[PDB]
Amino acid sequence: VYRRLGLGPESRIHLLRNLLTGLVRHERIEATWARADEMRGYAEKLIDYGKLGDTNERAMRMADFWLTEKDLIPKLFKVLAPRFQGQNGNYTRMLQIPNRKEQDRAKMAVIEYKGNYLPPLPLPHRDSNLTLLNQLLLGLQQDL
Amino acid sequence: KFDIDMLVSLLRQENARDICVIQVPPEMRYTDYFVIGSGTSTRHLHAMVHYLVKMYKHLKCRSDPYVKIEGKDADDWLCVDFGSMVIHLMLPETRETYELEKLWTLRSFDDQLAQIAAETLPEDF
Amino acid sequence: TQLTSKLNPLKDEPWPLHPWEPGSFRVGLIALKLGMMPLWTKDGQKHAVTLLQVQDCHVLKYTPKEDHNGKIAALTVGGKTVSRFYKPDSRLEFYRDLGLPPKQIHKIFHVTDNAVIKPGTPLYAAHFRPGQYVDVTAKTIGKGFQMGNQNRTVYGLKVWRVNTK
Amino acid sequence: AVQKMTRVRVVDNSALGSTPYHRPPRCIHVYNKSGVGKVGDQILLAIRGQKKKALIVGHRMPGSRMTPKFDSNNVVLIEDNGNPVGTRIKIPIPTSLRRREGEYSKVLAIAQNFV
RNA sequence: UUUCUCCCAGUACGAAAGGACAAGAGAAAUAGAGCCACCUUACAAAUAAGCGCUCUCAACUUAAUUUAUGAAUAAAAUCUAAAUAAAAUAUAUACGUACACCCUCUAACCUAGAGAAGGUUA
């Protein structure tokens, strides 16, 4: 249930720790698809710790350990946590990007923090209902 | 049915010299009755042991299965385990040496219990 | 709608019912393995038991004795309905004629002529009864290259209880 | 439990068992179709440089549920004729030996302590 | 799958001594196929393992041999490289189990898998 990355399990935590810290600072990070999926679960769980409250000692310990840069700790409790108070989940959005042209052709994906101020990503749009097929289905819906 | 009173009467008929019967309270998780019997000689011990089992099988006990006889190889101690009673049959002289009656009559005050000793088991080096 | 339409076999021109005679073979069922748990008897003994659930068990195709195997005829039964989105049209076409949603697995059961049942008849766990010994065959768990994923049969398994609901 | 080697505590008043000795009493053979010896299983114990059959009454191996796990391996000596070598047993002995297949009445009679 | 005990039964049998069968039941053992409710060791992950638990087979077709009928051979003969009727090991496949379906495949997921294949998809 866990990918093998880095030179060891501790390196994976440190690698995951670095990735989590980078995401918070920028809110949008591009990395290999396998690594991005691995870090997605941790990011969502951290927001739950932020929602728990700043005064929570466990959250403070967790926030301090995971976020190397301490200026982010106020941001989590005063920017990230307040923003997603309404939402119950799905805080992180991960999308596929064309593979890197670095001679290794690794699978590339982009993971972003939802609600950010960054420019909107070019997300896919479903087919419009004005299409012939959709219109026919709409007629069936109306009859029913 | 085969019960305590019938067996002891059968034991008397075959002339058991010494019979000891000890009841067990409900708290103690063992047979309700513990029985010890004396017999003059191994031939008498074999005869009496067979007689009780034959009577037991004949005397109903259909629900209960057949009872195997333990200790027939030994010439001084034969014991048969019935459904509600266990009879331990031995010679008269063998009776005093073992003192099964003291063990049950005196649950914790039997003299032979103290006779047990301890040891030490050190390593070679 | 399809399931409700097939709920009543006896009200859908049921095939003639024949009396039992020695040597008759009844059809089998397909069930899902829920899990295992301990079961106790009136003797105080604890017996581990396995849970099998019969889901959407229906007769699908009847094969005549001569046309399938001269020794005995066979009946096809399928359960555990599956989605229609990611399946070929050929499989859907066959089930559309039968009037039932597609089933995960098709299995063939050897059934005597007297015990033949019209296709589309719903089969329930009540076919078996407590106290009856039954035979279950299933594919073994696959282990990869080191294996498994081979059909095996277990014989002489008693049935302790059936949950009708 | 008691098996090849597996130095055991001789719970008996037998002269060899009762007398202290510098080497512990180990087992040489298990009188069962399987090689594992548990409570109620005859074994070929060794005492005072002699080989004497012993009956296992306790083991430290994990057991089935609803049963007490002993912290020490206990055995009872049995003569060739089948009568116990010792006339008394000190450690509490489980009463399941009565129902166990075999001849256990003699040992149970000699076992005043039952748990 | 194999062994052992019990039962049948201290019976049948036998002057006694002694002492069976077949059928049935209970214990184990090992082999094979599996499984994780419990226990135990691990992963100090939701998993994998045993030291844990469950389940495991039928004989159409015969051979050594033993009889019946019966000529050659005048029989109240002869089992017959005489014509003929029977009984009688182990083998094995008559008897089964398992397989049977005919192929959507962007992508995702999988106890499926080296790759491929395979399964799943509100």
XYZ file of C-alpha atoms (C1' of nucleotides) in Angstrom:
671
model
C 0.000 0.000 0.000
C 3.130 2.174 -0.077
C 5.469 2.934 -2.964
C 9.209 2.343 -2.579
C 10.996 5.642 -3.230
C 14.332 7.127 -2.274
C 17.170 5.158 -0.714
C 15.153 3.993 2.300
C 11.892 4.252 4.241
C 13.231 7.253 6.162
C 14.326 8.857 2.889
C 10.785 8.367 1.588
C 9.476 10.230 4.639
C 12.089 12.936 4.100
C 11.315 12.937 0.378
C 7.612 13.053 1.225
C 8.381 15.709 3.838
C 10.201 17.841 1.264
C 7.419 17.380 -1.291
C 4.741 18.342 1.236
C 6.679 21.450 2.271
C 7.160 22.491 -1.350
C 3.469 22.095 -2.149
C 2.415 24.315 0.758
C 4.763 27.134 -0.255
C 3.740 27.166 -3.930
C 0.385 25.277 -3.818
C 1.131 23.709 -7.237
C 3.942 21.215 -7.872
C 4.839 19.078 -10.894
C 6.475 15.690 -10.325
C 6.391 12.073 -11.451
C 2.909 10.569 -11.469
C 3.847 7.758 -9.078
C 5.364 10.147 -6.533
C 2.488 12.623 -6.846
C -0.083 9.939 -6.031
C 1.946 8.802 -3.018
C 2.039 12.315 -1.543
C -1.632 13.073 -2.265
C -2.852 11.079 0.731
C -0.526 12.832 3.169
C -1.558 16.285 1.946
C -5.259 15.608 2.525
C -4.645 14.209 6.012
C -2.548 17.245 6.958
C -5.444 19.594 6.172
C -7.551 17.626 8.652
C -4.862 18.307 11.255
C -5.035 21.986 10.324
C -8.815 21.988 10.701
C -8.425 20.427 14.156
C -7.022 23.723 15.450
C -3.776 25.554 16.129
C -3.965 24.933 19.883
C -3.866 21.174 19.246
C -0.479 20.016 20.510
C -0.416 16.996 18.188
C -1.159 19.179 15.160
C 1.612 21.588 16.161
C 4.078 18.708 16.494
C 2.921 17.226 13.186
C 3.044 20.607 11.438
C 6.515 21.398 12.789
C 7.971 18.043 11.724
C 6.437 17.920 8.243
C 6.997 21.602 7.384
C 10.706 22.409 7.589
C 10.097 26.127 6.998
C 8.378 27.480 10.104
C 6.809 30.486 8.358
C 4.406 27.992 6.767
C 2.975 26.925 10.142
C 1.029 30.204 10.585
C -0.062 29.916 6.950
C -1.501 26.428 7.469
C -3.588 27.477 10.475
C -4.490 30.929 9.094
C -4.598 30.376 5.308
C -4.927 26.701 4.411
C -7.107 25.600 7.330
C -9.581 28.538 7.247
C -9.993 28.227 3.475
C -11.181 24.599 3.528
C -13.329 24.753 6.674
C -16.436 24.374 4.520
C -15.042 21.527 2.426
C -15.008 17.996 3.841
C -12.369 16.561 1.506
C -10.849 16.500 -1.968
C -8.502 19.328 -1.001
C -5.863 18.328 -3.578
C -6.243 18.087 -7.360
C -3.900 15.841 -9.359
C -3.818 15.810 -13.164
C -1.715 14.133 -15.839
C 0.872 16.148 -17.778
C 2.782 15.059 -20.916
C 5.818 12.967 -20.073
C 9.181 14.631 -19.544
C 11.485 14.892 -22.565
C 14.545 14.165 -20.423
C 15.561 10.917 -22.222
C 13.875 8.825 -19.483
C 10.259 9.560 -20.503
C 8.992 9.411 -16.930
C 5.264 9.770 -16.332
C 4.526 13.371 -15.346
C 1.576 14.732 -13.377
C 0.658 18.028 -11.715
C -0.698 18.191 -8.162
C -2.232 21.466 -6.992
C -3.917 22.757 -3.850
C -7.549 23.627 -4.495
C -8.839 27.118 -3.814
C -5.467 28.616 -4.724
C -4.918 32.043 -6.265
C -2.796 30.564 -9.060
C -4.015 30.721 -12.675
C -6.613 28.028 -13.397
C -5.221 24.874 -14.945
C -6.587 23.830 -18.373
C -9.043 21.312 -16.975
C -11.024 18.996 -19.274
C -14.570 19.992 -20.189
C -17.329 17.456 -20.755
C -19.369 17.511 -23.945
C -22.081 20.149 -24.141
C -25.736 19.154 -23.981
C -26.266 20.907 -27.333
C -24.612 17.942 -29.066
C -26.867 15.746 -31.180
C -26.392 12.718 -28.924
C -27.038 14.731 -25.758
C -30.122 16.353 -27.292
C -31.583 12.924 -28.069
C -30.994 11.813 -24.475
C -32.593 15.051 -23.278
C -35.676 14.216 -25.331
C -35.859 10.831 -23.629
C -35.531 12.564 -20.254
C -38.340 14.991 -21.094
C -40.685 12.202 -22.205
C -40.095 10.243 -18.991
C -28.524 -48.694 35.890
C -24.926 -49.069 37.083
C -24.500 -46.898 40.182
C -22.349 -46.686 43.301
C -24.416 -49.037 45.465
C -24.559 -51.857 42.908
C -20.804 -51.952 42.274
C -19.797 -52.098 45.945
C -22.287 -54.908 46.549
C -20.767 -56.694 43.555
C -17.333 -56.000 45.043
C -18.469 -57.623 48.294
C -19.809 -60.647 46.405
C -16.366 -61.235 44.877
C -14.945 -60.645 48.390
C -13.057 -57.367 48.160
C -11.074 -57.212 51.399
C -10.832 -53.403 51.562
C -12.908 -50.831 49.665
C -12.515 -47.056 50.004
C -14.996 -44.614 48.460
C -14.462 -40.841 48.553
C -17.042 -38.383 47.263
C -15.902 -35.209 45.501
C -17.652 -31.860 46.123
C -19.003 -29.964 43.097
C -16.240 -27.354 43.395
C -13.503 -29.903 42.649
C -13.546 -30.666 38.913
C -12.930 -34.411 39.130
C -15.053 -37.561 39.294
C -17.927 -37.353 41.762
C -16.773 -40.547 43.511
C -13.248 -41.935 43.869
C -13.042 -45.616 44.814
C -10.085 -47.733 45.960
C -10.271 -51.514 46.253
C -8.067 -54.217 47.732
C -7.505 -57.714 46.377
C -5.557 -60.637 47.806
C -3.597 -61.619 44.688
C -3.092 -60.528 41.095
C -5.334 -63.413 40.031
C -8.017 -62.082 42.377
C -7.359 -58.567 41.070
C -7.868 -59.777 37.499
C -11.034 -61.674 38.440
C -12.687 -58.819 40.341
C -11.761 -56.249 37.681
C -13.349 -58.390 34.967
C -16.460 -59.026 37.069
C -17.225 -55.333 37.596
C -16.784 -54.496 33.907
C -18.933 -57.449 32.837
C -21.658 -56.413 35.282
C -21.319 -52.784 34.181
C -21.822 -53.667 30.513
C -24.755 -55.952 31.334
C -26.315 -53.443 33.763
C -27.711 -51.000 31.189
C -25.047 -48.269 30.583
C -26.180 -48.378 26.946
C -25.827 -44.602 26.625
C -22.309 -44.849 28.047
C -19.683 -46.568 25.863
C -17.633 -49.593 26.848
C -15.020 -48.964 29.535
C -11.403 -49.909 28.905
C -9.504 -51.559 31.758
C -6.315 -49.812 32.885
C -3.421 -51.370 34.776
C -4.120 -55.026 33.964
C -0.444 -55.356 33.026
C 0.555 -54.346 36.554
C 0.108 -57.161 39.070
C -0.396 -54.787 42.026
C -2.532 -51.877 40.737
C -5.546 -52.152 38.417
C -7.879 -49.189 37.887
C -11.172 -49.079 35.969
C -12.760 -45.739 35.021
C -16.559 -45.922 35.026
C -18.959 -43.105 34.199
C -19.685 -41.912 37.741
C -16.991 -43.730 39.745
C -13.339 -44.745 39.436
C -12.233 -47.940 41.196
C -8.513 -48.393 41.893
C -7.805 -52.045 42.711
C -4.558 -53.090 44.390
C -3.058 -55.590 46.803
C -3.479 -55.081 50.568
C 0.211 -54.372 51.176
C 0.317 -52.144 48.094
C -2.678 -50.300 49.559
C -0.787 -48.876 52.543
C 2.313 -47.972 50.523
C 0.404 -45.779 48.064
C -2.158 -44.482 50.600
C -4.605 -43.245 47.975
C -7.231 -42.951 50.718
C -5.079 -40.458 52.632
C -4.708 -38.312 49.507
C -8.468 -37.982 49.018
C -9.588 -38.170 52.657
C -6.961 -35.546 53.543
C -7.125 -33.284 50.496
C -4.126 -31.176 51.564
C -3.145 -32.835 54.874
C -1.976 -36.169 53.442
C 1.399 -37.133 54.886
C 2.903 -38.317 51.593
C 2.491 -34.832 50.095
C 5.240 -33.478 52.355
C 7.529 -36.322 51.251
C 7.963 -34.616 47.866
C 11.311 -32.832 47.572
C 12.972 -30.280 45.296
C 16.242 -30.194 43.363
C 18.724 -27.873 41.667
C 19.902 -28.122 38.053
C 23.077 -26.080 37.499
C 24.883 -25.992 34.183
C 28.264 -27.633 33.678
C 29.941 -24.224 33.336
C -37.773 -4.248 -14.017
C -35.958 -7.278 -15.439
C -35.543 -8.889 -12.014
C -39.191 -8.314 -11.086
C -40.383 -9.786 -14.390
C -38.496 -13.021 -13.654
C -39.514 -13.200 -9.979
C -42.465 -15.512 -10.685
C -41.390 -18.680 -12.539
C -44.529 -20.664 -11.685
C -46.651 -17.891 -13.244
C -44.633 -17.884 -16.504
C -45.685 -21.177 -18.105
C -43.534 -23.425 -15.885
C -42.262 -26.608 -17.491
C -43.928 -29.860 -16.382
C -43.030 -31.053 -12.891
C -41.830 -34.644 -12.571
C -41.786 -36.836 -9.442
C -38.578 -37.811 -7.698
C -37.011 -41.206 -8.351
C -33.651 -42.698 -7.339
C -30.712 -41.472 -9.391
C -32.001 -37.935 -9.956
C -29.555 -35.019 -9.901
C -30.615 -31.495 -8.946
C -29.047 -28.304 -10.268
C -26.417 -26.374 -8.334
C -26.059 -22.733 -7.336
C -23.418 -20.008 -7.556
C -22.673 -18.022 -4.401
C -20.250 -15.381 -3.152
C -17.861 -16.097 -0.271
C -18.642 -13.534 2.426
C -16.190 -14.851 5.006
C -15.727 -17.157 7.973
C -16.777 -16.969 11.618
C -17.145 -19.327 14.594
C -20.362 -21.252 15.174
C -21.465 -23.038 18.346
C -23.524 -26.206 18.767
C -25.791 -27.300 21.602
C -22.919 -29.553 22.724
C -20.846 -26.460 23.563
C -18.337 -27.128 20.777
C -17.171 -24.232 18.605
C -17.083 -24.857 14.847
C -15.616 -22.418 12.343
C -18.048 -21.931 9.457
C -17.821 -20.163 6.099
C -20.453 -17.762 4.770
C -21.771 -18.104 1.211
C -24.270 -15.672 -0.325
C -26.388 -16.569 -3.357
C -26.793 -13.456 -5.518
C -29.092 -13.208 -8.546
C -28.952 -16.938 -9.252
C -30.956 -17.699 -12.400
C -31.145 -20.528 -14.921
C -29.859 -19.257 -18.271
C -29.538 -22.016 -20.892
C -30.796 -25.601 -20.976
C -28.877 -28.174 -23.008
C -30.603 -31.380 -24.178
C -29.125 -34.675 -23.051
C -28.245 -35.845 -26.563
C -26.986 -32.433 -27.704
C -24.623 -31.951 -24.727
C -23.584 -35.376 -23.401
C -25.226 -38.722 -24.062
C -24.860 -39.695 -20.407
C -26.751 -36.720 -18.944
C -28.068 -33.270 -19.825
C -26.751 -30.016 -18.368
C -28.120 -26.668 -17.186
C -26.328 -23.307 -17.205
C -26.742 -21.040 -14.165
C -25.231 -17.600 -13.621
C -25.215 -15.198 -10.697
C -23.615 -11.995 -9.424
C -25.004 -9.541 -11.961
C -22.413 -7.250 -13.554
C -22.348 -3.895 -15.314
C -23.268 -3.561 -18.991
C -20.989 -0.608 -19.792
C -17.660 -2.411 -20.316
C -18.848 -5.616 -22.002
C -19.088 -6.640 -25.667
C -22.433 -6.339 -27.408
C -22.479 -10.101 -28.007
C -22.736 -10.872 -24.291
C -25.420 -8.216 -23.818
C -27.367 -9.529 -26.815
C -27.618 -13.021 -25.321
C -28.785 -11.664 -21.964
C -31.231 -9.257 -23.612
C -33.021 -12.247 -25.139
C -33.090 -13.940 -21.730
C -34.477 -10.734 -20.219
C -31.930 -10.658 -17.385
C -28.900 -8.458 -16.629
C -25.481 -9.953 -17.412
C -23.909 -12.239 -14.820
C -20.257 -12.391 -13.825
C -19.764 -16.141 -14.337
C -21.381 -18.871 -16.434
C -21.198 -22.408 -15.044
C -22.639 -25.693 -16.301
C -24.488 -28.156 -14.053
C -25.364 -31.735 -14.989
C -29.087 -32.191 -14.305
C -31.347 -35.153 -15.025
C -34.285 -34.812 -17.402
C -36.840 -35.055 -14.589
C -35.126 -32.182 -12.743
C -34.932 -29.841 -15.751
C -36.133 -26.301 -15.021
C -37.223 -23.682 -17.530
C -34.570 -21.016 -18.236
C -34.962 -17.778 -16.319
C -36.162 -19.469 -13.130
C -34.796 -17.659 -10.048
C -32.739 -19.853 -7.731
C -32.538 -19.149 -4.003
C -30.452 -20.323 -1.062
C -33.527 -22.200 0.198
C -32.817 -24.924 -2.376
C -30.356 -26.352 0.149
C -31.418 -26.993 3.735
C -29.597 -27.197 7.082
C -28.140 -30.622 7.779
C -27.392 -31.346 4.106
C -23.825 -32.017 3.006
C -22.747 -30.060 -0.070
C -19.806 -29.813 -2.468
C -18.188 -26.464 -3.300
C -15.655 -25.944 -6.096
C -13.810 -22.674 -6.673
C -10.650 -21.285 -8.229
C -7.733 -21.133 -5.809
C -6.063 -17.826 -5.000
C -3.352 -16.927 -7.484
C 0.145 -16.307 -6.141
C 2.000 -15.310 -9.316
C 5.281 -16.711 -10.549
C 7.297 -18.274 -7.725
C 0.813 -20.458 -9.253
C -2.758 -20.959 -8.087
C -5.829 -19.788 -9.985
C -6.790 -23.434 -10.543
C -10.228 -24.947 -10.024
C -10.467 -27.188 -6.960
C -13.369 -28.930 -5.237
C -14.047 -29.562 -1.543
C -16.270 -32.521 -0.674
C -18.349 -33.457 2.352
C -19.081 -30.006 3.797
C -22.145 -29.956 6.046
C -24.567 -27.018 6.064
C -25.208 -25.584 9.528
C -27.698 -22.778 8.838
C -29.281 -20.766 6.029
C -30.312 -17.101 6.234
C -33.394 -16.714 4.045
C -33.525 -12.908 4.157
C 6.826 -28.649 26.448
C 9.122 -31.694 26.581
C 10.957 -33.081 23.541
C 14.485 -34.034 22.491
C 16.586 -32.376 25.192
C 14.148 -29.780 26.613
C 15.304 -29.965 30.226
C 12.153 -30.487 32.284
C 11.286 -30.184 35.969
C 10.631 -33.599 37.540
C 7.453 -33.078 39.599
C 7.675 -36.307 41.571
C 8.927 -37.820 44.820
C 10.834 -40.572 42.998
C 14.289 -41.199 44.432
C 16.098 -40.297 41.206
C 13.895 -37.268 40.584
C 13.848 -36.146 44.214
C 17.616 -36.441 44.638
C 19.470 -33.351 43.348
C 21.777 -33.875 40.390
C 24.197 -31.609 38.554
C 22.712 -32.263 35.105
C 19.061 -31.343 34.451
C 16.558 -34.086 33.527
C 16.133 -34.030 29.749
C 14.078 -36.196 27.383
C 15.359 -38.649 24.775
C 12.158 -39.856 23.103
C 8.493 -38.895 22.740
C 6.038 -41.811 22.788
C 3.714 -40.486 20.102
C 3.241 -40.827 16.362
C 4.122 -37.138 16.103
C 7.450 -35.810 17.327
C 5.836 -33.157 19.536
C 5.161 -34.027 23.169
C 2.389 -32.261 25.092
C 0.382 -32.826 28.272
C -0.589 -36.471 28.645
C 2.073 -37.727 26.215
C 4.507 -40.396 27.379
C 8.204 -39.527 27.094
C 11.537 -41.250 27.744
C 13.013 -38.980 30.400
C 16.544 -39.250 31.801
C 17.280 -39.033 35.531
C 20.451 -39.703 37.538
C 22.102 -41.303 34.527
C 19.083 -43.592 34.086
C 16.300 -43.691 31.499
C 12.815 -43.508 33.030
C 9.522 -42.973 31.225
C 7.750 -39.769 32.254
C 4.251 -38.402 31.666
C 3.930 -34.741 30.681
C 1.452 -32.764 32.790
C 2.307 -29.196 31.741
C 3.985 -27.251 28.965
C 4.988 -23.678 28.158
C 3.944 -23.923 24.504
C 0.917 -21.750 23.639
C -2.275 -23.764 23.992
C -5.869 -23.639 22.849
C -8.259 -20.983 24.105
C -9.978 -21.412 27.487
C -6.942 -23.265 28.868
C -4.216 -22.130 31.299
C -0.700 -21.832 29.883
C 1.884 -23.237 32.280
C 5.085 -21.288 32.886
C 7.143 -24.458 33.469
C 7.330 -27.933 31.949
C 6.192 -30.567 34.461
C 6.358 -34.360 34.124
C 5.457 -37.391 36.242
C 7.499 -40.596 36.316
C 5.838 -43.889 35.350
C 7.199 -47.385 35.966
C 7.484 -50.087 33.317
C 4.486 -51.894 34.826
C 2.502 -48.667 34.331
C 2.275 -47.642 37.979
C 3.733 -44.191 38.750
C 7.275 -44.252 40.108
C 6.384 -41.583 42.656
C 3.555 -41.838 45.165
C 2.593 -38.138 45.065
C 2.587 -35.173 42.680
C 3.097 -31.634 43.971
C 2.315 -29.291 41.047
C -1.368 -28.837 40.108
C -2.308 -31.255 37.329
C -5.010 -30.474 34.734
C -8.075 -32.698 35.000
C -8.340 -33.075 31.208
C -6.051 -36.117 31.463
C -9.053 -38.173 32.595
C -10.836 -37.656 29.270
C -7.600 -37.913 27.273
C -7.202 -41.241 25.499
C -4.925 -43.588 27.438
C -4.413 -44.835 30.986
C -4.384 -41.767 33.246
C -6.412 -42.902 36.275
C -3.316 -44.038 38.183
C -1.556 -40.689 37.756
C -4.712 -38.726 38.581
C -5.166 -40.794 41.741
C -1.585 -39.882 42.693
C -2.238 -36.207 41.831
C -3.874 -34.544 44.831
C -3.704 -31.061 43.273
C -6.172 -30.527 40.417
C -6.783 -27.297 38.508
C -4.305 -40.920 1.687
C -2.036 -44.456 5.678
C -1.711 -46.466 10.642
C -3.530 -47.590 15.415
C -7.551 -48.365 19.272
C -12.623 -49.450 20.210
C -17.118 -51.811 18.627
C -18.915 -56.371 16.679
C -17.385 -59.873 21.295
C -14.545 -63.541 25.699
C -19.170 -63.804 21.159
C -18.387 -67.365 16.036
C -15.043 -71.425 16.888
C -12.990 -74.755 20.358
C -12.997 -80.545 25.214
C -10.346 -76.802 27.118
C -6.486 -73.598 26.309
C -7.304 -69.997 23.499
C -9.658 -66.735 20.057
C -11.951 -64.294 14.476
C -14.347 -62.051 11.333
C -17.110 -58.568 7.742
C -20.099 -53.999 9.141
C -19.790 -49.640 12.394
C -17.361 -45.836 15.621
C -13.311 -42.971 17.696
C -8.318 -41.528 17.546
C -4.098 -40.093 15.342
C -0.232 -39.931 11.371
C 1.321 -38.387 6.649
C 0.338 -36.808 1.611
C -2.460 -33.636 -1.378
C -5.677 -29.271 -1.966
C -6.893 -25.058 0.709
C -8.147 -21.433 4.607
C -7.097 -16.865 8.687
C -12.504 -17.128 13.481
C -8.689 -17.992 17.090
C -3.456 -18.516 18.507
C 1.835 -17.312 17.250
C 6.014 -14.740 14.317
C 6.601 -10.733 11.247
C 5.363 -6.100 8.102
C 7.103 -2.201 14.584
C 0.707 -0.669 7.401
C -4.891 -2.658 5.989
C -0.746 -8.073 4.524
C 2.150 -12.670 4.345
C 3.211 -17.185 7.118
C 2.819 -21.791 10.837
C 3.864 -23.172 15.341
C -3.036 -22.145 13.754
C -7.639 -24.449 11.192
C -10.659 -27.429 7.414
C -11.299 -30.992 3.589
C -9.919 -35.365 0.718
C -12.627 -41.257 -4.410
C -15.568 -44.733 -7.413
C -14.071 -50.223 -10.632
C -17.347 -51.748 -16.416
C -13.476 -54.702 -17.668
C -9.415 -60.467 -14.384
C -5.193 -64.547 -12.976
C -2.911 -67.678 -10.539
C -6.419 -70.826 -8.994
C -11.041 -73.742 -7.644
C -15.714 -76.063 -9.486
C -20.044 -77.746 -12.892
C -21.502 -80.345 -17.538
C -19.243 -83.353 -21.147
C -17.348 -86.432 -25.635
C -13.046 -88.231 -27.910
C -11.741 -92.910 -24.317
C -18.004 -98.909 -23.534
C -17.601 -94.382 -17.044
C -22.068 -93.491 -11.335
C -15.001 -90.524 -15.973
C -12.064 -85.797 -17.690
C -12.203 -77.588 -15.360
C -11.921 -78.009 -21.972
C -4.305 -75.783 -26.579
C -12.679 -80.268 -26.889
C -17.181 -77.766 -28.052
C -19.224 -75.186 -23.220
C -21.249 -72.746 -17.731
C -19.442 -70.471 -13.371
C -16.685 -68.543 -9.181
C -12.186 -66.124 -8.305
C -6.136 -60.769 -6.864
C -3.913 -56.442 -8.209
C -4.272 -53.624 -12.391
C -7.593 -49.697 -14.752
C -11.111 -45.129 -16.635
C -16.226 -48.144 -17.706
C -17.257 -44.039 -13.405
C -15.939 -39.149 -12.332
C -14.208 -34.077 -11.042
C -12.276 -29.606 -13.602
C -12.513 -26.985 -18.376
C -16.820 -25.242 -22.090
C -18.479 -18.428 -22.822
C -15.363 -16.456 -27.729
C -14.173 -10.978 -26.813
C -15.595 -4.245 -25.148
C -10.595 -1.973 -24.118
C -8.812 5.826 -23.720
C -8.039 5.347 -18.940
C -8.233 3.782 -13.790
C -8.063 -0.291 -10.312
C -6.918 -5.741 -9.063
C -5.863 -11.004 -4.069
C -4.304 -11.184 -12.369
C 0.567 -10.615 -14.033
C 8.083 -10.606 -15.702
C 6.188 -8.324 -20.457
C 1.854 -9.669 -22.735
C -2.587 -11.893 -21.174
C -6.631 -11.943 -17.488
C -10.528 -9.649 -14.081
C -13.112 -5.188 -12.411
C -15.513 -0.371 -13.960
C -22.869 2.730 -11.374
